[PDB]
């Protein structure tokens, strides 16, 4: 009787711990996915920003040179 | 200049999982043994 | 006696697992909060950067046109 | 020409080291809960 | 016999739960490290971008003033 | 005009798939630890 109680409580606890482990795995997978997507977003932003700042720099050098030619 | 408006950062919603974790941490009191 | 030992060890382990589940829930909540704040930060930065690059583009087109008018 | 200010854009940092330490502490202490009949 | 079965199953489950807790701690540590590195990256990017936009602003004001002087 | 270089700004990526796989493996293996008197 007490052995059956111990076994039933243990099986209940193991089921709840299995649910908790599945929930933790799901949460960690979602966090990994979103952190990696935001990492890719920041990397793409840094790349595009480098490009745009190079372009602005080229245009600015051209405008400064053309103002030097004007005056 | 290059367009960057497409750069989007996703958001995560794991509140179901956190709620399940706290629910299990509370329900594990019903699994204690009282001989 | 052995049943009391089994029950006591099981209750101790269930208490420790409850502590660990609360700690995991707290850590996952904090990670979620910070990941979402950084997502909002990157989104706001992308918006403001789009605005500033549009503004720089308008000013650059104006300056190029006014240099065309000069020369 | 005035460009928009972005210095307010701040990204928070997370400190869950208490929780990781608690997890490792419990993973170590669960040896004291093993049954030795 | 049944007590030995209960004890063996409990010890097996506690070993598996210890493995799972170590895995969760490792995953949370890695997620913390990467989230904090990306936070530092976004902060450094915001700083450098503020600097570059201030520089572009200064150059643009100078060019506009020098065009005003031209015309 | 020499604008500041930002190409060094890199955002790391996390790979915790080993840990998620271990968690799911343990959640599956805990069925072998159930008691059947």
Author numbering:
A (entry chain B), C (entry chain A), E (entry chain C): 918 to 988
B (entry chain D): 1166 to 1200
D (entry chain F), F (entry chain E): 1164 to 1200
Sentences from the paper on this structure:
Our high-resolution wild-type structure of the HR1HR2 bundle resolves uncertainties in some side-chain positions present in prior structures. Overall, our wild-type structure is similar to previously determined structures of the HR1HR2 bundle. However, some side chains that were assigned to different positions in the prior structures are clarified in our EM map. Consistent with previously determined structures of HR1HR2 bundles from SARS-CoV, MERS-CoV, and SARS-CoV-2, our EM structure shows that the interactions between HR1 and HR2 involve an orchestrated network of hydrophobic, hydrogen bonding, and ionic interactions. Most of the hydrophobic residues of HR2 are involved in hydrophobic interactions with HR1, with only one exception—V1176, which is completely solvent-exposed. Another notable feature of the interactions between HR1 and HR2 is the abundance of hydrogen bonding between HR1 side chains and the HR2 backbone. Thirteen out of the 19 hydrogen bonds between HR1 and HR2 are formed between HR1 side chains and the HR2 backbone, and only six remaining hydrogen bonds involve the side chains of HR2, including S1175 and S1196. In addition, two salt bridges, D936/R1185 and K947/E1182, are formed. Note that the HR2 fragment is synthetically linked to the HR1 fragment in both crystal structures, that HR2 is naturally linked to other parts of S2 in the postfusion EM structure of S2 (18), and that HR2 is not linked to any protein in our EM structure of the HR1HR2 bundle. The root-mean-square deviations (RMSDs) for the backbone atoms, side-chain atoms, and all nonhydrogen atoms between our EM structure and previously determined structures are relatively small.
